[PDB]
Write an enzyme that holds these catalytic residues in place. Structure first.
Site, mmCIF file in Angstrom:
data_model
loop_
_atom_site.group_PDB
_atom_site.id
_atom_site.type_symbol
_atom_site.label_atom_id
_atom_site.label_comp_id
_atom_site.label_asym_id
_atom_site.label_seq_id
_atom_site.Cartn_x
_atom_site.Cartn_y
_atom_site.Cartn_z
ATOM 1 N N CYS A 61 0.852 -1.178 0.000
ATOM 2 C CA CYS A 61 0.000 0.000 0.000
ATOM 3 C C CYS A 61 0.897 1.240 0.000
ATOM 4 O O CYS A 61 2.119 1.128 -0.082
ATOM 5 C CB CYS A 61 -0.969 -0.003 1.183
ATOM 6 S SG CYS A 61 -2.609 -0.614 0.647
ATOM 7 N N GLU A 62 0.254 2.395 0.092
ATOM 8 C CA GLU A 62 0.977 3.655 0.104
ATOM 9 C C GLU A 62 2.261 3.523 0.926
ATOM 10 O O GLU A 62 3.313 4.018 0.526
ATOM 11 C CB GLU A 62 0.098 4.788 0.638
ATOM 12 C CG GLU A 62 -0.263 5.774 -0.475
ATOM 13 C CD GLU A 62 -0.964 5.060 -1.633
ATOM 14 O OE1 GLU A 62 -2.066 4.524 -1.386
ATOM 15 O OE2 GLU A 62 -0.382 5.066 -2.739
#
Length: 149
Positions: A61-62
């Site tokens: 993810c980010e």
């Protein structure tokens, strides 16, 4: 004679899919959602290392993503984790909320993306990014597969 208790996170308790709707109800602008979302994380407690070990590592993810859960006697699973990216951190909330004491089956009976989409805390998120939420969710599908089996 005693009973230990930790992870005093909201998700359902005070952060129910509804409460979130009441907060976003007025916030029609995604900018707000994405904004307040950041604050959603702040609210969340700092995931300690001890818990980090109790949770699984998520680097899809980010930024870093920690998540962990356990099936109760009846199945009532309890999710608990955190993330580096405030935004992501907040997202979890909604998720943890969508999985408010939900059962593996239930999850499969209804993806936690519903809330996200409903609130639009993802439905807006670019497809690419969307790929992330999926992964997260998949984490359950994988689990549910175990509980199911």
């Amino acid at each position: 004679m005693t009973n230990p208790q930790f992870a005093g996170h909201p998700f359902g308790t005070t952060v129910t899919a509804e409460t979130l709707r009441n907060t976003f109800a007025p916030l029609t602008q995604w900018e707000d959602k994405y904004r307040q979302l950041i604050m959603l994380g702040k609210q969340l407690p700092a995931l300690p290392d001890e818990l980090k070990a109790q949770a699984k590592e998520i680097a899809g993810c980010e930024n870093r993503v920690w998540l962990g859960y356990t099936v109760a006697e009846n199945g009532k699973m309890h999710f608990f984790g955190d993330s580096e990216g405030r935004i992501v951190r907040g997202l979890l909330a909604v998720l943890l909320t969508a999985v408010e004491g939900k059962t593996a089956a239930e999850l499969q009976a209804q993806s936690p993306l519903a809330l996200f989409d409903e609130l639009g805390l993802r439905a807006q998120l670019s497809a690419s990014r969307s790929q992330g939420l999926n992964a997260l969710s998949e984490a359950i599908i994988a689990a549910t597969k175990q509980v199911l089996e």
